[model samples]
Target: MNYARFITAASAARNPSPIRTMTDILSRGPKSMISLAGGLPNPNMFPFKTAVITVENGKTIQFGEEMMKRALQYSPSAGIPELLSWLKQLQIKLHNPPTIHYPPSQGQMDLCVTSGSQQGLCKVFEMIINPGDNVLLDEPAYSGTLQSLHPLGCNIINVASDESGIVPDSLRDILSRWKPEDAKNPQKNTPKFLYTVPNGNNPTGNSLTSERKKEIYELARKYDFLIIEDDPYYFLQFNKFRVPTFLSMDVDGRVIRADSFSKIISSGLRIGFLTGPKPLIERVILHIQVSTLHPSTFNQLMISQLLHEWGEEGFMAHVDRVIDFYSNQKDAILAAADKWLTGLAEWHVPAAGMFLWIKVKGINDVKELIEEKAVKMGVLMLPGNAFYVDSSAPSPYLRASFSSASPEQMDVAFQVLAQLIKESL
Candidate 1:
């Protein structure tokens, strides 16, 4: 892939911050080489004291004097070394990305930690989308994604989705806009990438199947474009086996994947990471240099300590426990909807994640019904208009999160929801 051509002019133009660049270079210098290039504060001047924290199973992790100061100070743009190593290890075991050991030969598959997965997703869009750049996205997309890209004045091409997630034919229709030979040749205005949430999609909780993923991968290869796999809910799926990730299927180094701890771990922790080709990852790291500096090293140390304590087996066990929690939540809402909303409203059995995107049979638009009637009657949901590329469009759908409400509450809630629908009709 011509990554240089693929990146926006602004992204291509960005050079690494001088101090940060020197920080990396000197850190690799010989032990006798004294460094005075950066504005780094003296670690000893830091006031932080030792701290202790607890994780699952009541395990204790202590950040002693040395670790505490290190945690408080700025780390690498990618992440604190400890956490970056662990994340890279996790990505390999989970995805086993074919391009991990490439640069053609020198490996390019690297990971960078961000403030959160949303930040990682946000920065990728910033790096790629220029004004009026044609970008592909799922219909009724994740609102945050639309929020991030909408301001950039990009031409968003919405691909229709089904119960199984992004429809391959719809993607084909958009890609085939170019002549067969023209698509592979790299034109001046080809869609730079396809942004997808393949597992446990927000607004519409659907998981793309392996075949569907392969089908989409082939289309990207044919269209000769990049893919941004923003998979915040990768571990939240309830399927018997985890589906293959676009990253795992990426043989051509065209996929950039973002993973979040927000779902399985803690959202307030605000830690997520992106893995991709070396250059793309470096571009994001430069963006981090000018803005966030580095994701809070203290937070990085916190997660690093817990992950070290858990190990892979214990971590998977914890993830399995979380899946059970959300899966039961999903079932509770489905049962309530089945009893009260079966005929009046329609929803897919959410394959994974926290939402039930319901289509109200009687209403042409959910915004008014929800804001005026549903809330007044003491129930609330996000109207579908918020999730679209064009927020003004009237939509028959609305999204509800099943995470916080109990089964009993869900039953009562759906009953009220049903009555509200009837009243609006």
Candidate 2:
């Protein structure tokens, strides 16, 4: 039994992320250094002790232990109903469609719970993406989603997007022009899904407004295509005081919304979720059951305990606290960027999430700048090309994680970056 074939096959796989190559450098570089590479949450703010304390209560303990045992053992195919019900209730409160158990036989729609949003996304691609299937995506799409779906061998069409995010008019026009008769050489693959984050997007630090979301939803209804709303940073969003979700806004259930617990409660538990038509979520659940059995019942059960403890009002408050925290950090970074990089660089003020994307003046070698100069200058940031699906050409942009960096670090980081920009000239 030669293991070389298996190992080599996996090792030689195609990569959609250009910045993945930087992981080795960042990982082995320093143990005590500041890290802004991964899309991780603030560990200092995690409610681990509270979770333990809550789960240890006599009432929760018995059921928690039982569920923990079941979590360790084989469970149902659909998922733990209690957890699903809690999620369903939350969705209902938010005005999304009611959650259903069994999907229609035709499988046009489905629902599923997974280890994380990424798992749900992977499953969706598995179910829908056949060879040569096309997907319409935003220009700066999530690299992780791009990576997961790349192995399916589809043609990804980059739709034009504005600062307001994907322009509905542009999408409607693109789909309108994709008719077979109009193509000189017709693409064998037609689009299966139009993917967008819409809220607190990565790299770009922009969120689509409600008006934009509504326009896209209308476009989906008119053009007849599904939407993979892979929004991991939904709860992390600070841009909107109260933004409508694509799931809640879906009148015809054309949007499949992917959400994550990583940004809100904690990332260690990896509680990501998706909601759509019953059929689609169900099919995704099938993939979830087979691939990873079920998401950790202990984790979900504990999260349920936290939610129960927090109650609906408390949960909303928790999200508000997180928003307030991130907003402060976001402003700090932006202010530093403004003060330090004003003359040499440019960036739009971010409204949500952790990243502040800055495009340097007259500089396109971001990979080399970060790896060689930024690192040496005692500051580090992610290159913009990492968000590009193709991952070959570099950009003049860089991404800064405001969630993790401290005020002092933020100042130094920007100062170093600003100096580096001056040197690049």
Candidate 3:
């Protein structure tokens, strides 16, 4: 399919980034062609001495000399060559998607680094959503995504979901009767994309099974819409069986997967990558070039070196330790809920990720509790309505994170929450 044809008007109107164009021109400069088109700083003036990183696997990686030079200089718009190559290798080992080796050929898949997966996600929406275009979201969606899509004026449709993530029948039902004209006045276009976090979904923390993912992928094929799999917590799975990713099941290039080092590595690094069809990734790169130009050159080099040192097996072992840590935390939170909030609220035992979605009994919204009770008690949580497309509506749920809290803290937090619910009643 010509995925480029599905791009929004804004994307279509965007020109190649001027700086990138100049950089390309500069690269082709003859030996004697000393030109000052760009204001690139002198390398000698850079103040970095050395970058040393200690990985979870008890190994240290250092970037100095030649590595530092690349880190301090202007690099390719897609990413630094070596880092891009390593990321490509990582993707191949993990997802095994079909793609041209380096420079992606026509209709093949490829990837590009972004400042973060969130930025990659923003560009995906920018490429697809013309104002008023239909976009599907898992209900109680990630607030960050809702925040991004809201500004674009897209018709955000809420797809129903349970413990296993999005319900396929609900998605099929919505698509079956969907009319381009039924959308808001300015949006006379059919649904263009479905944005979801397939693994350890934010707020809900529900990971979709392989069977569910296949059904959803088949539905996307039938509906002729794209799937944006924003999976930041894919490595946080606590179960013995790994849930299949939408991108892994994708054969027709319909799924665009965005991944991050935030949860696994560190959020401050602001490094992430997107994998999908070359055509789509090409558009995202244009956006990347015009915006941040590329992810931090320093961070990319640091991560690449670390990945080189760790290799595949070492990386997986680190992930296993991370999972073990979070699994213990999850168990503590669930046990706290069972003891403190059993009769007062109901919640799903999260199989993976950081949060627990709780439906408090006899409450229309959790906002009051958040402001009046939870805060004063030093127990914080996100009101469920914040995750919805329409925050104006009422919701009985609240999202609590177990990723960082201690067992005692979890117990106290839930105790406070339970008291507030009881008081409200």
Candidate 4:
């Protein structure tokens, strides 16, 4: 329950962001006060009067003159008030995390808007990880996260995993063996945090069950480590029933949940939200205030208005349609794999997300196959080792994304890949 004890050296050492300090002081200045401080552009000179976002079913949501004007102007670092309110409502309705106060401002839980969920992840890492800090991640993880953490000089540890995501036994085994004597002898450094994507996880397309989530949460509590749930594919799930999130199960304020509109909405909008304990969120907002100064005001306003128009039911209906699109793509990729690579490579049927994580049989490495054979054969795939903390480690895996490939293209790509595998053997 104590958050201060968990604070990283880097976070404790950071000076208060200058812009946040200025805004806090200047906003309460006398009415007659005139100031020249920051270098914000004039909103009056902005050219746009309105924005029209066209959705499926030929419907358009319009952001009119007033909304446009508000969007163009400078706003609070946390987010524009209206967008934050809508997001707060959505988070409550979806996760329903235990709250000590009704409205978030007075409550233990709150939310912050970011340029993208990736930015939120970056800031969280900055806030919590000092050089040489230990961190844990699922094997065959999202390479983007691995790339981000590398620059921070973390002692990256991989937990064993299968199709259902990180194995509970493996997590327990790792934690049980982390001893101080081992630490003295070039040994186990206890992880400060564990990062994962529970629903429709990237690259692996593995979705964790509710039981597994609870187990992981219990492990996190026992091991005394924070959990970072980086779930951009929460809405892309193809399950007949909903999977419980680690955030939803968290009552001790140990989980920091990062969600994004990129996979569900337009990525170019660059809008995402982070929800967690108020103190942690405050630090992230301070970082955002100094970093990007907040996400695009115009884009945030546009998305806010659009969500208002859709409402919860309508928004879910749109999500269902997107799920349908990816479902068909998943089917196409699976069919192609069955037809061409039945005996050549092994893979799991992805229940959600865009990728199929295939383990090529009879091969200890895939770098040459990807760069020489697959590319020359007019197909491309991400070599599996790229997802590992140690990229030079041997792996026979390859990740193929069905998000953009056509049904016919998938068939052709796998067909060529199958032939190349045969030749390599």
Candidate 5:
């Protein structure tokens, strides 16, 4: 894989921190060479001491002096070493990316912990997208991702999607117009990468089928572009089994996956990880080294400790409990939709994620109705235009989240929305 072609010139030219470089050597250096090299804050000065985190599964994270000092002090820019290894192992069990066996120069697999998947995604956009670079975005893309990409000056080519996910035919047509393999149009810039939320996309809450993934991966391989699978909801699938991921299918090292703990774990923890080709991970680590410096040291250790205590089985069981809780939440909203929104609105039975995409039949644009009047009636949902590349264009759809509302609250919301729609018409 020509990794250089995918990385922006700025990222490729970036230099690693000198002191940070020395820190890596210091870790391996003999303890006898105890010379003052850089800012060395005695861990004793740190206020926080031993801490404990107890989850519902009855597992607790409690470590002693050595672990406490490591948690309080500064760590590697890549991530806490133990946490990196743990997540890498998790990714292996989940995806088993083929690049793990390949040489570093030939696309080795790697993982990096980030402040959150959003930060990881942002740095990646910074790393790959240059001004005027064409990038493929699934239609009705995540607003956060759009916000990150817009400032980078990359042109967004909206890929058509529906109740499922990215339409393979639409993608084929988009790539066919300017085939990267052939030079039919010499000046037209081919897409640098494709951004997609493979499982339970944020607003749409729809997942791509495995066949679709295979076809999309083939298109990426054919066009010689990378795929950024921003999947924060992989653990929330409602199917009988797990949906296939782009990373799982990434044989040519073209897929970069951003996994988040916000949905499954505590969002306030602000912990996330990225798994992809070694060079790409290294580039992102460099970007992180300069910016956030690294995810909160203690937070990383907290999760690392939690995962360590809860073996793989305990982790899966905890995930199962989370899934069951959301499954009930999904059921409530669906029932509420039936009770009150039967005629007023339409929606897809979400396969994963917390949101349901609803279309109001009578309204041409839902922004004013939702923002101005719906709020007045104590009902709130994200207008569909917010998720679109061309938000100004009229959108009849609205995004409703089932993550917080109770069954009765959901029923009330839909009932009020139904009344509002009737009143409007």
Candidate 6:
């Protein structure tokens, strides 16, 4: 028997996406080029040197050696109690839901620890998504979240987006047009959740203003659905404008907030949390329990210790520095795009985070360029098509990451891109 024939419905339904494939291609290619593909934080700034200095082998400041060892080891499946407490403090500060002392089996509400925000996203998909479930997503979304939702076989409905962010009118229109009868299968009735990167969003580099967030939340309440704020870049919101989070304004218990230390501290730590209703959290916990058992204790403990040592002000300062780093990178990309592409490409200057979403002029073959031309030209970038669940639609966008590119190389990379655009035209 063929192996493909033995696969389950869930496994057989999904396709390997462009995001993963193109990334692997770029990574395996030559090293002389610049990559505007992955939204990876610069490792040079990672507090590894600081971590090594402040924390000796078998010892961590403000936390015991045994605790540090346990951190490297596995412990309570819900995550370290104190880490959970600190996250509770974060949620309470945000003001959506109150923190509970002891959480139930499914969830404690306003508390969840995962390998990263991506893992939290996977848990949410497991809990609510069944085969043919109709889910809503902003077009050109973060690929990690999209990949996580793939195997679940949800009928992902794409909503239109603009510079201000996901258009409220478009979202409202989509929801209004939706009906229970549209469910492809009886087992997968009703729209389940809305997944969006509201704050300094990945790939797009646009932050949903407080006004847009409120409009979205109101829509959710009206439609009787929930939202997943998959905000890895939440803390990376920049200096010029600070937007209120959905969790802060969520009056009803309809928003589930996912956040991470990946953008702020380091991705290797893979620490993140989700806040939502207790009942939903419990289901999510069950979803998480079967996989990986628990999050990394050592990782959680170290981050908790770092937070403890820094306190609120210190932590905020570090985040500001990271924001500054990305801001400078974004500025450089914008300048390059302006100088190089001239009128050929248009983009919004990212208010926060590391991306510059360039709408390339007159060129629709971004994916083909990535596969055929981009690599041979000795530059790398992610095609905007991977951001959409359906790649057949025309999206003349290309996502460029500023964080990973060295300052000197970014200029050359954009120059290559400019020449490529010119050649294509």
lDDT-superior candidate, 3 or 6: 3
lDDT by residue (134-193, candidate 3, tens digit) is 788888888888898888897888889998889998988988775433332333465788
Clashes of each: 0, 10, 0, 0, 0, 6
Q: For each candidate, what TM-score against the reference?
A: 0.95, 0.81, 0.91, 0.90, 0.96, 0.80
Clashing pairs in 3: none
Give RMSD to native, each candidate: 1.9, 13.5, 3.2, 3.5, 1.7, 13.5
Ranking by TM-score: 5, 1, 3, 4, 2, 6
TM-score for model 4? Answer: 0.90
- Native-referenced Cα lDDT, model 1: 0.86
Candidate 6 lDDT, tens digit per residue, 225-270? 7778888887777654567777676555566789888877779878
The worst-scoring run of ten residues by lDDT in candidate 6 lies at 1-10
Clashing residue pairs, backbone N/CA/C < 3 A, model 5? none
User: Which of the predicted structures, 3 or 6, would earn the higher TM-score when compared with the native?
Assistant: 3
Q: Whose TM-score is higher: candidate 1's or candidate 3's? A: 1
TM-score, model 1 to reference: 0.95
Error of 2 at 401 (Å): 0.4
- The stretch of ten residues in a row with the least summed lDDT in candidate 4 is 179-188
The sequence of per-residue lDDT tens digits that candidate 4 reaches over residues 1-425 is: 55654456666565655455665667798878666777677767889888787867435877788878877888878888888998988888888887635344423788899999999888998898777888888977888898999998988888888888889999888888665333333234567789998877768889887888898888887766789999999889887466878878777778899999998887999999998888778878877766797889888877876788888988888889999999999999999999999999999888778888899998899999998878877789989988888889999999999898999999899989999999889
lDDT of 2 by residue, 153-191 (tens): 878888888677888777877777666332223244446
Per residue, candidate 1 scores C-alpha lDDT tens digits across 69-181 of 88888777778888899999998899999897787423278899999998888888989887877899888888888889879998998898999999999999888778545
Of 2 and 6, which scores higher on TM-score?
2
lDDT, residue 128, model 4: 83
Flag regions of model 3 displaced more than 4 Å. Answer: 17-39, 98-106, 178-188
The C-alpha stretches of model 6 lying farther than 4 A from their native spots are 1-65, 96-108, 178-188, 392-394
lDDT of 4 at 243: 88
How well does candidate 3 match the true structure in TM-score terms? 0.91
